[PDB]
Design a binder for this molecule. Sequence first.
Ligand SMILES: CCCCCCC/C=C/CCCCCCCC(=O)OC[C@H](COP(=O)(O)OCCN)OC(=O)CCCCCCCCCCCCCCC
Ligand SMILES: CCCCCCC/C=C/CCCCCCCC(=O)OC[C@H](COP(=O)(O)OCCN)OC(=O)CCCCCCCCCCCCCCC
Ligand SMILES: CCCCCCC/C=C/CCCCCCCC(=O)OC[C@H](COP(=O)(O)OCCN)OC(=O)CCCCCCCCCCCCCCC
Ligand SMILES: CCCCCCC/C=C\CCCCCCCC(=O)OC[C@H](COP(=O)(O)OCCN)OC(=O)CCCCCCCCCCCCCCC
Ligand SMILES: CCCCCCC/C=C\CCCCCCCC(=O)OC[C@H](COP(=O)(O)OCCN)OC(=O)CCCCCCCCCCCCCCC
Ligand SMILES: CCCCCCC/C=C\CCCCCCCC(=O)OC[C@H](COP(=O)(O)OCCN)OC(=O)CCCCCCCCCCCCCCC
Ligand SMILES: CCCCCCC/C=C\CCCCCCCC(=O)OC[C@H](COP(=O)(O)OCCN)OC(=O)CCCCCCCCCCCCCCC
Ligand SMILES: CCCCCCC/C=C\CCCCCCCC(=O)OC[C@H](COP(=O)(O)OCCN)OC(=O)CCCCCCCCCCCCCCC
Ligand SMILES: CCCCCCC/C=C\CCCCCCCC(=O)OC[C@H](COP(=O)(O)OCCN)OC(=O)CCCCCCCCCCCCCCC
Ligand SMILES: CCCCCCC/C=C\CCCCCCCC(=O)OC[C@H](COP(=O)(O)OCCN)OC(=O)CCCCCCCCCCCCCCC
Ligand SMILES: CCCCCCC/C=C\CCCCCCCC(=O)OC[C@H](COP(=O)(O)OCCN)OC(=O)CCCCCCCCCCCCCCC
Ligand SMILES: CCCCCCC/C=C\CCCCCCCC(=O)OC[C@H](COP(=O)(O)OCCN)OC(=O)CCCCCCCCCCCCCCC
Ligand SMILES: CCCCCCC/C=C\CCCCCCCC(=O)OC[C@H](COP(=O)(O)OCCN)OC(=O)CCCCCCCCCCCCCCC
Ligand SMILES: [Cu+2]
Ligand SMILES: [Cu+2]
Ligand SMILES: [Cu+2]
Ligand SMILES: [Cu+2]
Ligand SMILES: [Cu+2]
Lengths: 239, 382, 77, 153, 241, 96
Amino acid sequence: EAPLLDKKWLTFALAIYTVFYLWVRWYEGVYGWSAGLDSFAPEFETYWMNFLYTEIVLEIVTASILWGYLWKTRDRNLAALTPREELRRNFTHLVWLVAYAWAIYWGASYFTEQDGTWHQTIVRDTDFTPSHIIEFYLSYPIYIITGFAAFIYAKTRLPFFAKGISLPYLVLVVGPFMILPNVGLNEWGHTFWFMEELFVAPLHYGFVIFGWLALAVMGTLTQTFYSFAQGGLGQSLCE
Amino acid sequence: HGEKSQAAFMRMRTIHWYDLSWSKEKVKINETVEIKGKFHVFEGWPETVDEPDVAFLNVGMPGPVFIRKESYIGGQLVPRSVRLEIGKTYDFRVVLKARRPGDWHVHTMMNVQGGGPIIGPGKWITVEGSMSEFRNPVTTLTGQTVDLENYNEGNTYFWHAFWFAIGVAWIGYWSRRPIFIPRLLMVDAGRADELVSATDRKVAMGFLAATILIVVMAMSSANSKYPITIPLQAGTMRGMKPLELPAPTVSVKVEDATYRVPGRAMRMKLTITNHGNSPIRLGEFYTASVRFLDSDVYKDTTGYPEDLLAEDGLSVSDNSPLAPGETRTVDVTASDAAWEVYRLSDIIYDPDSRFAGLLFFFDATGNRQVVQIDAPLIPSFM
Amino acid sequence: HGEKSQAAFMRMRTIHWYDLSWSKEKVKINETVEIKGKFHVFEGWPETVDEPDVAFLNVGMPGPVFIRKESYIGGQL
Amino acid sequence: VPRSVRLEIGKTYDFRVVLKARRPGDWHVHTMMNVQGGGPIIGPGKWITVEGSMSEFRNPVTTLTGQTVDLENYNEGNTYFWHAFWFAIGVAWIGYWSRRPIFIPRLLMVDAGRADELVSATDRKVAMGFLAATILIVVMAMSSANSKYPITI
Amino acid sequence: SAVRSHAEAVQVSRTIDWMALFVVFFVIVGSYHIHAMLTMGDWDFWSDWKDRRLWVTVTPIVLVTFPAAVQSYLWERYRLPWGATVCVLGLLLGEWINRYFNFWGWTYFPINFVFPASLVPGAIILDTVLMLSGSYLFTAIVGAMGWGLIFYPGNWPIIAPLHVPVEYNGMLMSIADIQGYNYVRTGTPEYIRMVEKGTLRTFGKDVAPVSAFFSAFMSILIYFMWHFIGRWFSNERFLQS
Amino acid sequence: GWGLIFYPGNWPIIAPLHVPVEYNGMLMSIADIQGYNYVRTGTPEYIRMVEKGTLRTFGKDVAPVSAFFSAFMSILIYFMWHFIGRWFSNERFLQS
Ligand SMILES: CCCCCCC/C=C/CCCCCCCC(=O)OC[C@H](COP(=O)(O)OCCN)OC(=O)CCCCCCCCCCCCCCC
Ligand SMILES: CCCCCCC/C=C/CCCCCCCC(=O)OC[C@H](COP(=O)(O)OCCN)OC(=O)CCCCCCCCCCCCCCC
Ligand SMILES: CCCCCCC/C=C/CCCCCCCC(=O)OC[C@H](COP(=O)(O)OCCN)OC(=O)CCCCCCCCCCCCCCC
Ligand SMILES: CCCCCCC/C=C\CCCCCCCC(=O)OC[C@H](COP(=O)(O)OCCN)OC(=O)CCCCCCCCCCCCCCC
Ligand SMILES: CCCCCCC/C=C\CCCCCCCC(=O)OC[C@H](COP(=O)(O)OCCN)OC(=O)CCCCCCCCCCCCCCC
Ligand SMILES: CCCCCCC/C=C\CCCCCCCC(=O)OC[C@H](COP(=O)(O)OCCN)OC(=O)CCCCCCCCCCCCCCC
Ligand SMILES: CCCCCCC/C=C\CCCCCCCC(=O)OC[C@H](COP(=O)(O)OCCN)OC(=O)CCCCCCCCCCCCCCC
Ligand SMILES: CCCCCCC/C=C\CCCCCCCC(=O)OC[C@H](COP(=O)(O)OCCN)OC(=O)CCCCCCCCCCCCCCC
Ligand SMILES: CCCCCCC/C=C\CCCCCCCC(=O)OC[C@H](COP(=O)(O)OCCN)OC(=O)CCCCCCCCCCCCCCC
Ligand SMILES: CCCCCCC/C=C\CCCCCCCC(=O)OC[C@H](COP(=O)(O)OCCN)OC(=O)CCCCCCCCCCCCCCC
Ligand SMILES: CCCCCCC/C=C\CCCCCCCC(=O)OC[C@H](COP(=O)(O)OCCN)OC(=O)CCCCCCCCCCCCCCC
Ligand SMILES: CCCCCCC/C=C\CCCCCCCC(=O)OC[C@H](COP(=O)(O)OCCN)OC(=O)CCCCCCCCCCCCCCC
Ligand SMILES: CCCCCCC/C=C\CCCCCCCC(=O)OC[C@H](COP(=O)(O)OCCN)OC(=O)CCCCCCCCCCCCCCC
Ligand SMILES: [Cu+2]
Ligand SMILES: [Cu+2]
Ligand SMILES: [Cu+2]
Ligand SMILES: [Cu+2]
Ligand SMILES: [Cu+2]
């Protein structure tokens, strides 16, 4: 008779992102000045290019392992899922959504405007600035991994989402992912199209457009609520 | 920082910064440093850079470690964008005030609209002290002296916190009840009208009226407190006075200019005609912030950034007094690690292999003539 | 009419009209009036006004109360 | 002036053009100034007669790498070879599927719900091999071209 | 059954309410913040960009986007009238966090030079109009008019002390202008700022009201379009491929 | 993949045409000399939309950046033209 909501998992989901991104901010503060200013220097290499390579390799490994583990341990027979266990799985999926929202805030909101700050205070020299390394290649893949994991868990554990591919969930999960390829346009926007460090330039409208797809969350939320209510919780609550 | 990654020919063919001075190398907090010099606009302006019809004199540094107290182009203060003419030389002066301690690489730059950044030579300046001692006093036309570091901070905090608290209260008034699932079921069941009561309507009306009235009263109070206000001052300042410089009594033609691609040097054949000004001798070749000097003819005493100063990087086949009238063809060799360090050797990736730079000629009395050269640069691979 | 509402600095920094003459102050119908003068273009042209690469010499009046018989800039129609 | 240039209104310029005869016949030759945002400005045309055979025309050019080439036929065979190679690969890919019934029986099977029977494991292996071979061949060809011509601008 | 009693169901529903509020709030923070910054953030970053023509016109038009969709979802499905307020609060929270911890904590730009614009009154007006009227067309028209018109009066108490004239080195300057001049933005030259510079067709002290009315009209249009955009975004559809 | 493989696939063909030449004192490409010698009367030199270098152009990243931008826009255009073709495949009959 485990509790319906696992408080330890929710606390971990918040705390791991909080601590990791606080350490990332500390690293940016410590080494963003001594080594990050000049891109053709050895300290810049050993303090940011190594970071980029390590983060890319770790992101690939983590995404592969997590997605493969979630897809391998799927519930083959969901017809025997008891309503209480279905409610517990719904709470776990809600914890996954909480983690995805926290990662989305950390990526799209915090580090994007930090990148804006960085570009307004220095002269851009390379596409692999420390700000670009942290924002485009660390936070965006992290929230992409979290969203893919949440979608896979919902599809493989919740009977509500197991009957097909949820269009609002697919838009909410893949839409922000398209922000990562669009970075190329951003680079093509800064190197060829726009000669000025203007944050409202059209070369950034790609980001904006895919950010709009995050609004799909509302539709997803509705489905989630029905997944919470179809198991008998709604009937008891309406009384 | 940011020049090494810029195309070599773009750096060679835009703006040339010649004799520069820094008043101090180490400053304390609140102390001022003056950077003066001359900048020449190259006649063969690249086509992908818009003409400097709208240009801004800027200071390149990792942030507000200094504050730009003032900037003058031709003796005229230039807080706004200005208009520069192709082929003219201008004096510039920048007075900065130290704000944050540490070692800072400071550059003078010309931001050009439709072109991008044009960074000049950077110098390392050390600031000693504490940032807490920095003050920025400004006296207004209303008779008030304020400190720009903390002026109007509390008012902004108060108003933002007030409006955020109002929004939080508006959300929390509705947040005391069941939020998502029961309300969704009631709306689906057709009982939506039961979710809003008359008291809720009265609360919404009060919120709207209070918001409008508070905004109006706050605007009136702000107008009363500050009855004298002006809009933001902006515009492009034309009519910058250029330098009226002695035309070079020295004529230089570039026969050939080549660079070995592996390579840390550049070589050029030059025909030089002296049109008076006594026997002259080449003492320096300036390319892209890099100065190659002939120690026997000239020595820098201005503290030019050493990473960009090659004291004996100019090798002239015959650097003997060029008697007025003599037309000598000489082979000059500009060699220095800066060629590779500042990635000037990356002209091999450029869609335009042409260079431009400045040659400095000195007579027996020390008078200096500046000659401007431009040519195509041919890589050597054999 | 229409100048009082134009920005003061824009009026100060564009074109200066110096010595001007009007041939007549009171005219009959079908009679002609000549307005001559000099205009100087200010060197510090405002940036929000395009350079006078395409400019037209016009007469400001509430309509065709007159008809512009001719106009000359530097002696050229 | 191998590139576009900038001209000033009201100025006079000398111009010289050296041309080399390539094809026989009578040709009306004009000197012109193409102006961007304006169009063509044609000058006086003169009739010039070229006598000989086009097969005798040569265009020798010496590169900075020490190689002398003829621009009439330089790099022609390489372009033909690569285009023919890729066209043959595409034709083979199409013809692998073209050995079976194409349009009507496959359409009926898809409509009947038997689409999964139209692709077998061998077809999947062939597609995987085609993709891997294409990527590997592109990479190897780029490496070989870089090795053959290490100096490019 | 999933729950054993009505009280347990109520407690579970409250927990779901809190968690879903967290999810909605922070997803809105991320998406709205990225959209808002990449649409109008140059005027929002610096105090010398807060002019009467471009800032006042542009900011409400681009910022009315998310509140329209979130209102169209929340009021229709839950009768929750706080969509615009929650969007504005999330955007303000993200912006202030970045200003304090990155603009000032990292690059040491003074807070009085880098502060966001106030947006709560417009969201409150929109939310109250939607709640009291109950119709999206009237809400669109009147609430968007109010949202566009109240933007500059709401922010005037903050920026008014920054417009005191100063005779700086012989030239007339604003306090915000001196702030922009002294604190060097290496990547942001002076010519980039889209601020009013005066036109020969500019009339007698009508810049700010005209900008506000134009912003209100375009806010009406953008609210009308984004209501249906959000209606599409709220679809509960399932795909089979 | 379609966006990224375009330039590596064509490099073996155009690589011999990029050998530098000192043509009449100016550095030229073999393709540049081909364009110079063989006169296109209706195609002047200023029309060619080719890279000329920008002050924001960085250290040898032109081709990869162009390839990645092309790949992203190819994703977008493929997504739109899939539905365009789906509409074009409709078997509808009209009565007027
Ligand atoms: C479990 C916690 C609750 C969940 C929410 C997360 C809240 C956590 C906040 C962490 C506070 C400590 C920050 C100090 C780091 C402490 C820290 O890392 O200090 C070192 C750096 C400075 O290093 P340096 O650059 O080498 O130094 C030279 C120039 N300073 O400062 C900082 O990083 C401080 C500034 C940035 C701190 C981040 C802001 C706090 C994060 C808030 C997240 C938003 C949550 C919303 C909730 C409403
Ligand atoms: C945010 C941008 C919105 C994208 C457009 C909306 C999606 C397309 C709708 C119409 C066609 C599909 C059917 C209904 C949708 C939902 C959907 O795709 O359902 C699966 C259907 C198959 O289902 P069915 O039972 O056979 O009948 C059709 C369902 N109405 O797939 C399709 O019809 C084709 C594939 C769907 C389109 C791809 C996924 C769209 C998600 C965004 C992609 C990423 C782009 C953004 C990145 C920045
Ligand atoms: C390639 C461009 C696509 C054009 C748009 C698609 C055609 C229009 C569709 C909606 C209205 C018609 C009904 C469905 C279509 C097919 C169609 O036109 O059917 C006949 C119907 C009448 O049929 P019905 O049984 O009464 O019920 C409607 C059928 N869905 O006509 C109409 O409804 C009006 C005339 C149709 C439109 C003109 C022909 C379109 C062909 C292209 C014209 C040339 C332009 C391109 C030249 C470069
Ligand atoms: C010490 C702090 C608290 C405890 C730590 C555990 C988490 C906190 C709370 C919930 C569990 C508490 C008790 C658990 C005891 C034991 C424990 O560690 O349980 C958690 C999982 C087991 O997951 P489960 O079987 O679903 O069952 C969980 C319900 N108790 O442990 C594991 O070993 C992980 C499971 C296998 C999946 C691994 C994921 C792939 C890893 C590779 C990297 C992925 C990518 C990285 C990022 C890029
Ligand atoms: C689908 C996504 C489309 C974009 C919609 C979101 C807003 C994004 C960008 C534009 C916002 C304005 C700020 C500039 C940032 C976008 C940006 O960077 O704009 C640069 C220009 C100034 O530089 P520039 O050298 O002129 O460059 C032109 C590139 N757009 O700003 C401008 O605003 C001026 C350009 C002309 C556009 C005027 C604004 C639109 C006026 C209203 C009509 C449009 C319809 C409105 C709805 C009724
Ligand atoms: C940051 C500062 C935070 C400000 C907090 C403001 C408080 C907000 C809301 C209070 C909710 C109370 C609702 C009571 C209804 C609770 C309610 O509905 O009670 C039944 C009354 C019965 O009243 P009655 O006498 O029979 O009829 C009216 C004439 N006598 O109905 C009502 O209609 C009562 C309406 C009262 C509504 C009060 C809300 C006004 C709030 C404005 C706040 C101003 C902002 C601050 C100014 C600086
Ligand atoms: C312009 C030059 C033209 C190039 C022509 C290339 C030939 C193309 C296709 C051959 C089709 C054979 C299919 C046989 C399956 C015919 C087939 O499916 O046979 C059953 C086998 C059984 O094999 P098994 O041993 O039981 O299991 C595998 C390990 N033993 O299944 C298979 O899966 C066989 C897969 C074989 C597929 C071969 C295709 C590879 C083609 C690559 C061509 C490379 C391009 C040229 C390089 C220069
Ligand atoms: C509507 C309910 C009635 C309440 C009053 C309404 C608003 C106030 C006054 C109405 C009288 C009109 C004259 C304004 C005072 C007129 C007024 O106060 O004008 C101030 C300045 C002028 O400054 P100045 O020259 O130094 O002053 C001398 C003027 N000879 O103009 C402006 O601010 C321009 C007006 C603002 C732009 C809006 C124009 C309206 C466009 C139509 C669409 C908007 C309407 C919505 C339709 C539903
Ligand atoms: C149009 C609908 C009628 C109701 C609104 C009244 C219409 C007139 C003005 C309001 C637009 C904003 C102010 C700028 C005008 C246009 C206007 O009058 O601008 C002049 C100054 C701004 O000038 P500046 O050069 O920046 O110097 C600062 C001096 N204040 O603003 C004002 O004088 C403010 C005028 C009114 C302020 C109160 C706003 C409240 C009304 C708007 C909300 C309506 C929502 C209704 C809810 C249903
Ligand atoms: C700036 C101008 C205002 C913005 C425009 C939107 C305002 C309102 C309505 C106009 C278009 C949306 C109405 C919904 C379509 C209309 C709509 O709601 O659904 C149409 C169907 C629904 O999918 P279905 O069930 O599979 O199809 C069978 C019919 N139910 O979409 C499709 O079939 C696919 C196309 C849908 C594309 C709509 C996406 C909405 C746009 C998101 C982009 C961001 C916003 C851009 C504007 C800036
Ligand atoms: C993905 C699976 C793992 C395999 C490796 C992936 C690709 C290779 C390396 C990864 C390390 C990153 C650093 C690159 C080597 C870095 C590298 O080789 O850069 C070469 C040149 C730089 O030339 P240079 O200055 O003379 O050299 C000195 C540099 N200090 O830059 C480039 O070519 C620019 C990079 C290409 C543009 C793409 C940027 C990425 C944008 C994000 C969207 C695309 C990603 C897709 C998302 C799914
Ligand atoms: C992004 C997804 C990961 C997989 C692809 C690897 C990503 C990196 C580069 C590939 C883009 C094309 C090359 C230009 C880069 C960008 C890059 O590296 O450009 C430099 C040169 C071009 O320089 P130049 O000035 O024109 O001089 C010629 C010197 N070669 O290209 C390269 O060095 C080529 C790099 C890699 C070539 C192999 C391409 C194979 C990978 C792409 C296909 C992937 C499809 C996967 C199928 C599922
Ligand atoms: C560049 C951006 C990507 C291209 C855009 C297309 C990508 C995918 C979806 C977006 C629009 C097409 C979806 C089909 C409509 C959606 C569609 O498939 O059919 C809508 C109905 C079908 O006709 P019906 O049976 O009579 O109506 C009852 C509903 N079945 O069309 C209509 O009623 C008439 C309008 C249809 C017009 C669609 C034409 C497609 C465009 C062709 C132009 C060329 C492409 C331009 C883009 C560059
Ligand atoms: Cu960008
Ligand atoms: Cu530097
Ligand atoms: Cu010069
Ligand atoms: Cu008059
Ligand atoms: Cu004048």
